[PDB]
């Protein structure tokens, strides 16, 4: 705290309480005994624990019929109107678009829609497989996520 | 018809004005003005100015009947305190309060 290290008043003699600095935490304009510092909250996850959790997440997805595997998923143009036309015909509104090969033609079309997200097959995470209601697989992404989990 | 009439930020403590205000509670305006005329207090002329202001508001702003008009409710509420410093002996300071009050006078016909 920006201030002086001078003792406010005498140790004895005065009727006031014993004080040594105006920067004390029991004083106004300065305090906070255990002040926070910029720290790291990330905690270590074992490779077998992370891979084991993803396999258990994917195993529950097929038990809740939320995993929909398809042969291919690609739009002809980056327009979001025709992408929004696509998944509405298969009765999906809030899905996680995961494909084996991330194409910029599909990346641009799903950038504005809030309830969908496009990722690469190597870049999967647990939380998006849980937060999103449904999740759709293309044919070659299944063979790529199978070997990365093993 | 109530016709409230107050005087906020009166330069006097509420304790001194409550002594004067207790004299005219439940009295006719004719008798209350006569009582306040011969009362030798600073608050006596303070609340008399409010009372005649309350009487005039009871004839111009609304209603009538000045003679049949009774001071039903009267009270003095303390206002903000303006605080000064009185230099005392031994280099010490004693802080004084210039106490104010809100003299509210409401007078009706019944």
């Amino acid at each position: 705290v920006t201030g002086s290290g001078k003792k406010p008043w005498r140790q004895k003699g005065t009727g006031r309480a014993r004080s040594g600095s105006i920067k004390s935490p029991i004083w106004r304009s300065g305090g906070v005994t255990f002040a926070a510092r910029p720290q790291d909250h990330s905690q270590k996850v074992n490779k077998k624990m992370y891979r084991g959790a993803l396999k258990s997440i994917l195993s529950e997805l097929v038990r809740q019929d939320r995993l929909i595997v398809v042969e291919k998923f690609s739009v002809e143009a980056p327009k979001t109107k025709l992408l929004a036309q696509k998944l509405k015909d298969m009765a999906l509104e809030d899905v996680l678009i995961i494909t084996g090969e991330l194409d910029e033609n599909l990346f641009l079309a799903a950038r504005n829609l809030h309830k969908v997200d496009v990722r690469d097959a190597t870049g999967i995470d647990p939380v998006s497989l849980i937060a999103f209601d449904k999740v759709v697989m293309t044919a070659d992404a299944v063979k790529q996520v199978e070997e990365m989990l093993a | 018809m109530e016709t409230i009439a107050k005087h906020r930020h009166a330069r006097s403590s509420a304790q001194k004005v409550r002594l004067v205000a207790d004299l005219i509670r439940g009295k006719k305006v004719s008798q209350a003005l006569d009582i306040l005329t011969y009362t030798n207090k600073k608050a006596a002329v303070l609340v008399k100015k409010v009372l005649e202001s309350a009487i005039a508001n009871a004839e111009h702003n609304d209603g009538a009947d000045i003679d049949d008009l009774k001071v039903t409710k009267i009270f003095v509420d303390e206002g903000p305190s303006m605080k000064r410093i009185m230099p005392r002996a031994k280099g010490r300071a004693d802080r004084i309060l210039k106490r104010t009050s809100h003299i509210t006078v409401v007078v009706s016909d019944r």
């Binding site: 008043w9 003699g13 009727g15 | 031994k90 280099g91 010490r92």
Partner: peptide, 15 residues
């Protein structure tokens, strides 16, 4: 806000 002159001390004794 100043302190006080402190109470005048008495003559301290010894053994």
């Amino acid at each position: 806000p100043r302190p006080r002159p402190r109470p005048r001390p008495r003559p301290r004794p010894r053994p």
